[PDB]
Every structure is written in C-alpha cells, then in structure tokens.
C-alpha cells in the first residue's frame, strides 16, 4: 500500500520508471491490458505522465495505447462528447506524430461504438482534427479570423467517402465547441 503510493509518485515523475517499479515489486501484472486499466483508472496518477507513456513509439506502449482506447466507452456519444471524455483521461503529448497515432486509435474506437455515423474511420479521424483545430480557432486569442459555422461546414466538404456529412451533425459539433472549449488536463 505504501509501496503502491511510492510507485504512483515514481510513475508521476517518470512513467517508464514507475511501471518498472510496480512490475518488479509484483504490484502490477506486466500485460498491456493490466497497464491500460491502471492508466484508465488513473488513481493518484498525473495525466501528463499517462499521456507521455501512451505516446511512446515502443511497440508495447502502442499495445497499451490501443488497450487504453478499448476501455473507453463512446456508444451513442456524438464526436465532440467522445473527444471530451477521451481528452480528459490523459494529457495529449506535444508531438504531432504522437497525437496522430493516439487520434487514429480514438477514431477506430469511436466508429466501433457508433457505426453508421461515419462511412469510414478516416472520415472520423479527419473530422476529429477539424474539431481540435476549431477548438483552437474559436478559443485561442491569437486567432483573429474566427471561422463561422458555414466556414466549418465548407472546410469539411468531401470528407465522407467523397461526400459531405449532414449539416445537422456539423452545426451540433461546432455549437458544442463554441459553447465549451475542450477541458485540457495537467
């Protein structure tokens, strides 16, 4: 118990070291599923350390990433709602390539939970980035040219198997972002 509190503190400073500690002292089973659950529950865990671990390119951290995304439940959630839940569970790492890998795992899982919303996982992936960019455009003061809902609709044309997504869907997502910037954790 104070060994687990020691491991949690060690993980928060260095995720690789903390997991190495928890495994070595038989406090955490060494599987991607058990590690993904420990991260998903995140009890006494820092969300930047969670994100840093999930963002590593090592084949095993990638396995943990996919197992972590599998624990997320996105059924009957619109894309923004699902993004909010996902983006709250860990802090996105800084690197563009790490964010892309994490967003690919998110898009696949969103579509698995909501088949029929998007013709392909790639449409979901592309729209998820357009939503992230929209969140910055609307809420970051350095962006002076704020996109209107019509501009957001026009910018996303042709993404759904060559076609356009329903405007009701796009307007709803835009409205959600406009009314509430993504909560970004530390």
Curated annotation (Swiss-Prot):
Keywords: Acetylation, Cell junction, Cell membrane, Coiled coil, Cytoplasm, Guanine-nucleotide releasing factor, Lipid-binding, Membrane, Tight junction, Ubl conjugation
Entry's Gene Ontology molecular function annotations: guanyl-nucleotide exchange factor activity; lipid binding
Protein name, as recorded: Cytohesin-1
Statement: the UniProt record of this protein carries the keyword Acetylation: yes
Domain of life: Eukaryota
The SEC7 domain, residue ranges: 11-140
Compartment list: Cell membrane; Cytoplasm, Cytosol; Cell junction, Tight junction; Cell junction, Adherens junction
Role description: Promotes guanine-nucleotide exchange on ARF1, ARF5 and ARF6. Promotes the activation of ARF factors through replacement of GDP with GTP. Plays an important role in membrane trafficking, during junctional remodeling and epithelial polarization, through regulation of ARF6 activity.
Modification after translation: Ubiquitinated by SCF(FBXW11) E3 ubiquitin-protein ligase complex. Ubiquitination induces proteasomal degradation.
GO biological process, alphabetically ordered: establishment of epithelial cell polarity; regulation of ARF protein signal transduction; regulation of cell adhesion; vesicle-mediated transport
Reported effect, residue 95 to A/K: Reduces guanine exchange factor activity by over 90%
Tissue: Ubiquitous.
Residue window of the full protein shown: 63 to 248 of 398
GO cellular component, one term: adherens junction
Primary localization class, coarse: membrane
Entry remark concerning the domains of this protein: Binds via its PH domain to the inositol head group of phosphatidylinositol 3,4,5-trisphosphate.
Quaternary data: Interacts with TRIM23 and CYTIP. Interacts (via coiled-coil domain) with FRMD4A (via coiled-coil domain). Interacts with FRMD4B. Found in a complex with PARD3, CYTH1 and FRMD4A. Interacts (via N-terminal domain) with INAVA (via N-terminal domain).
